[PDB]
Amino acid sequence: FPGQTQDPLYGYFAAVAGQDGQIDADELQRCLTQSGIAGGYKPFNLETCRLMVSMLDRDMSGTMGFNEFKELWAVLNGWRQHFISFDTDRSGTVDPQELQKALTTMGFRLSPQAVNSIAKRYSTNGKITFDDYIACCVKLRALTDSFRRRDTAQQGVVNFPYDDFIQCVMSV
Amino acid sequence: FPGQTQDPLYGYFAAVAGQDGQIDADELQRCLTQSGIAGGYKPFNLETCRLMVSMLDRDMSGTMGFNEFKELWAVLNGWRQHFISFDTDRSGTVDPQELQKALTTMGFRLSPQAVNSIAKRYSTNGKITFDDYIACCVKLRALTDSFRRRDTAQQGVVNFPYDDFIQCVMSV
Numbered sequence A, B: 001f002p003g004q005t006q007d008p009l010y011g012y013f014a015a016v017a018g019q020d021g022q023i024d025a026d027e028l029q030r031c032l033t034q035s036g037i038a039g040g041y042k043p044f045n046l047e048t049c050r051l052m053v054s055m056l057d058r059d060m061s062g063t064m065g066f067n068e069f070k071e072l073w074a075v076l077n078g079w080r081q082h083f084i085s086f087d088t089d090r091s092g093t094v095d096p097q098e099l100q101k102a103l104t105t106m107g108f109r110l111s112p113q114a115v116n117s118i119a120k121r122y123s124t125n126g127k128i129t130f131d132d133y134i135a136c137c138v139k140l141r142a143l144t145d146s147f148r149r150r151d152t153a154q155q156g157v158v159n160f161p162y163d164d165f166i167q168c169v170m171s172v
Ligand SMILES: [Mg+2]
Pocket: A056, A057, A058, A059, A060, A061, A062, A063, A064, A065
């Protein structure tokens, strides 16, 4: 009984959720905007929301419930902290070098080539929005889990048949 | 030089290109819309255009020049025609079984399982839109190029170190 309280995140979710207690990507975009997790920056774009839904969609419903929303909140905060470290000018954007450190402090060791190829895919006039940073974190997590589960020899090299490579990457 | 003419695509490009002769995804979105490549279908959204830029970004600039735009136009025409052979009444969508026959007619060599996962990734109410079909085609061709390049022995298997895998899959 004692030590219970109203979850402060519940309100944002109930404002957008259907009577079934579920939200889809569009509904997720709205309540994330409301939640202030993107701060003063722009809303997450709809591809970023699709990625976030897919990340937590364990019943393959195309939707999430409130418990998953709270899980998502925890994940997004972890990643946001690394971002606001190196968002030294409060831009809501990081440059490629800043990005490299954020991902580094998260424990990704990526080469300058891997970072540059991430930056160029999501740059907007040479800088990466918080929105695109989050999309990138979601994809990195999924593709890294895909790589790791196939590393039989445990030397950081995976033997990828073509068909498996395609399904694996196209599924994200 | 006889047979020289003004290239009819140059105008669409020159209207949005910077003085450097380059376009980013936003600009490409605009000039593909003007160009009429969609026919009666809806315009491509930004994310599909980012994929397009990435498919032809041989110098990792995050932009495209006019010659690459010219290539892109040819490629899209070919894909649009296959799409239309399965969307006779121009609804703007195609279903999963038709997507499979499209990809095989296209030259993509994919297991029924792989095609299934691709159809599920791009379904919305059991239907694949035109924008999502093109996004799929772009992504398949880019990832298949990256794979082919690492498989000059043509064994259909590539040994991918983690950093190269990431560089490669995050760029598209
Ligand atoms: Mg679900």
